[PDB]
């Protein structure tokens, strides 16, 4: 739920009716297929909250 937005330099996801930017993560989001299909997709990092623990 929410929409991807940028302030010009950084990418966030907000709920749609009130500006509240969240850092984009694998639990803010879901995957479907690959980048070649979608008209206007943008290149970015998605943070995975498990990776700091696997970095122990």
């Amino acid at each position: 739920e929410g929409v991807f937005v940028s302030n010009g330099t950084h990418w966030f996801v907000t709920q749609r009716n009130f500006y509240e930017p969240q850092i984009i993560t694998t639990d803010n989001t879901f995957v479907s297929g690959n980048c070649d299909v979608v008209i206007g997709i943008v290149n970015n990092t998605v943070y995975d909250p498990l990776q700091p623990e696997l970095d122990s």
Binding site: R16, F30, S32, G33, V37, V38, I39, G40
Partner: protein, 49 residues
């Protein structure tokens, strides 16, 4: 509030209980079906009394 039209249609798909990747993956087909369906409105009204 402006929003891109394909991104508004992705909200209309969530509103019927279809996950929005279904629109972004099928976007040209969905656009052609709409454009073709509006063409059938012209041809019906430009013919039927």
């Amino acid at each position: 509030l402006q929003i891109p039209f394909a991104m508004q249609m992705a909200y209309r798909f969530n509103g019927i209980g279809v996950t929005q990747n279904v629109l972004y993956e099928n976007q040209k087909l969905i656009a052609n079906q709409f454009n073709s369906a509006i063409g059938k409105i012209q041809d019906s009204l430009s013919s039927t009394a």
